[PDB]
């Protein structure tokens, strides 16, 4: 249905004034397609999906030069932030940045994002109108004011509504077989005895794409989150995802409990029951 | 593709 392109950037300083590590990754939907790691040998943007490999040298050289400039910028930023927060050069600090765009089913722009965190906390973000900024702390106001005065948002807005979507469309087309697929979950339930008279029921969803999924338990048709365990959706390692949900029930009452699976690849939601 | 401009905070 809807699709996204996102880039994630992490710059990490080590104590002692050494040079930071910088990692960039790019995603289309739930599929990674490029990387840059400052630790690695190449010092180049690298492919991580088959459909991007066909891009030519001007791509790779261009993405490399831009990402190195991203890196260089963040190296400076880490220093600047230490100043803004009146921090010593004793610790390790982190800058994170994410930006990208969403499109609708019609592949038209829907939404854009451009935001930063410092040491794990929101620092500054472009608001949804792509014309204004949000910065919670005092320290970040300086940045907001610089960027406001230099009309940075206007330039980001043109990328996010424009260029970004164009790239996303290109990747969706070139990576159609991978990206435009839906893999419905393969499901099953397990049962193990617990204590003297209880049992764990576990509802499994495997080999699905995209990652968005809903698993829920009902007791006699009543939704239940109590005594329920839901794990984070996790990568299988092969481009699909996994998830499970479990409940602990008294033995003999297993058949009161139903697991409900919702996913885009499913014509109808699924119900599972232990027998 | 990524941004083709950069700016310091």
């Amino acid at each position: 249905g809807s699709h996204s392109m996102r880039y994630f950037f992490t710059s990490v300083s080590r104590p002692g004034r050494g040079e930071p590590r910088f990692i960039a990754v790019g995603y289309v939907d739930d599929t990674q397609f490029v990387r840059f790691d400052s630790d690695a040998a190449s010092q180049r943007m690298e492919p991580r999906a088959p459909w991007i490999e066909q891009e030519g040298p001007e791509y790779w050289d261009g993405e490399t030069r831009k990402v190195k400039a991203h890196s260089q910028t963040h190296r400076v930023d880490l220093g600047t932030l230490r100043g803004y927060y009146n921090q010593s050069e004793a610790g390790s600090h982190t800058v994170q940045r994410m930006y990208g765009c969403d499109v609708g089913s019609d592949w038209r722009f829907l939404r854009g994002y451009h935001q930063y965190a410092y040491d794990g906390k929101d620092y500054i973000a472009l608001k949804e109108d792509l014309r204004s900024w949000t910065a919670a702390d005092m320290a970040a106001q300086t940045t907001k004011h610089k960027w406001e005065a230099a009309h940075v948002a206007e330039q980001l807005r043109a990328y996010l509504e424009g260029t970004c979507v164009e790239w996303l469309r290109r990747y969706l087309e070139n990576g159609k077989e991978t990206l435009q697929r839906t893999d419905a979950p393969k499901t099953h339930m397990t049962h193990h005895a617990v204590s003297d008279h209880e049992a764990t029921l576990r509802c499994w969803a495997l080999s699905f794409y995209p990652a968005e999924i809903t698993l829920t338990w009902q007791r006699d048709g009543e939704d239940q989150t109590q005594d329920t365990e839901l794990v984070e959706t996790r990568p299988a390692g092969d481009g699909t995802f996994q998830k499970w949900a479990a409940v602990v029930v008294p033995s003999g009452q297993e058949q009161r409990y139903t697991c409900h699976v919702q996913h885009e690849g499913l014509p109808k939601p699924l119900t599972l029951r232990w027998e | 593709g990524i941004l083709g401009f950069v700016f310091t905070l």
Partner: T-cell receptor
Framework: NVEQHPSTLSVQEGDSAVIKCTYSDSASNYFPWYKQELGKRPQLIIDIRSNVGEKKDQRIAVTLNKTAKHFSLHITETQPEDSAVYFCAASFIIQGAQKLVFGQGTRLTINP | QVTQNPRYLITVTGKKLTVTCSQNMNHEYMSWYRQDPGLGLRQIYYSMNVEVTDKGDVPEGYKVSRKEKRNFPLILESPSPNQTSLYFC????????????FGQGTRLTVTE
């Protein structure tokens, strides 16, 4: 590379002057013009960003074609005080930084 | 303002000199340029912030320092006749994006 020609231009008082710059990098996104009076320092007089095709400030304006990668300073109804060296710049990524790269300059003379 | 000194300078070849540049504008970015006939404004060195320095397009024969925000001196360890020029310091709120505020200029002649 940012190229600014001609090196010199003479225009009659009251007529218009146009100075054009070309640039190499299609990602360039900021284009300022600096005025330098004889013996004095350069000073920004007007600028434009790539999301805009023309920007004006009364008698003066800048026009941009980001596809063809050129832009121009327009000075209408020139006055004697418009006599100066004018420098254009384009901003783009060079050596890991967003940088203003200046053209070679154009010496404008407003003749009586 | 941006405060650049001296306005005029003579040195013999080989004798170390320093050109000063001070600003009290609440700007993190500073840079040095050389202005020569026909060549425009060429960047010598720039500094994105305190204790950060990076070469420009013509760094040879020059050094700088940025131990604090307000100052960005230009050092010529061994001045050469080909370093005879008009030097400009500039500062900016955001390099590559905003107005460059220039100093008054230093006119240096290196003599044999």
């Amino acid at each position: 590379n940012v190229e600014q020609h001609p090196s010199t231009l003479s225009v009659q008082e009251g007529d218009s002057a146009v100075i054009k710059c070309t640039y190499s990098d299609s990602a360039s996104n900021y284009f300022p013009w600096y005025k330098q009076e004889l013996g004095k320092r350069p000073q920004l007089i007007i600028d434009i960003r790539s999301n805009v095709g023309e920007k004006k400030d009364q008698r003066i304006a800048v026009t941009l074609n980001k596809t063809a990668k050129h832009f121009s300073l327009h000075i209408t109804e020139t006055q004697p005080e418009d006599s100066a060296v004018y420098f254009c710049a384009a901003s783009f990524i060079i050596q890991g930084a967003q940088k203003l790269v200046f053209g070679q300059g154009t010496r404008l003379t407003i003749n009586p | 303002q941006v405060t650049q000194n001296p306005r005029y300078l003579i040195t013999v070849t080989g004798k170390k000199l320093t050109v000063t540049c001070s600003q009290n504008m609440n700007h993190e970015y500073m840079s040095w340029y050389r202005q020569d006939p026909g060549l425009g404004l060429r960047q010598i060195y720039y500094s994105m912030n305190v204790e950060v320095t990076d070469k420009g397009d013509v760094p040879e024969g020059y050094k700088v320092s940025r131990k604090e925000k307000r100052n960005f001196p230009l050092i010529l360890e061994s001045p050469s006749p080909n370093q005879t020029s008009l030097y400009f310091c500039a500062s900016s709120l955001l390099g590559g994006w905003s107005e460059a505020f220039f100093g008054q200029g230093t006119r240096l002649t290196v003599t044999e």
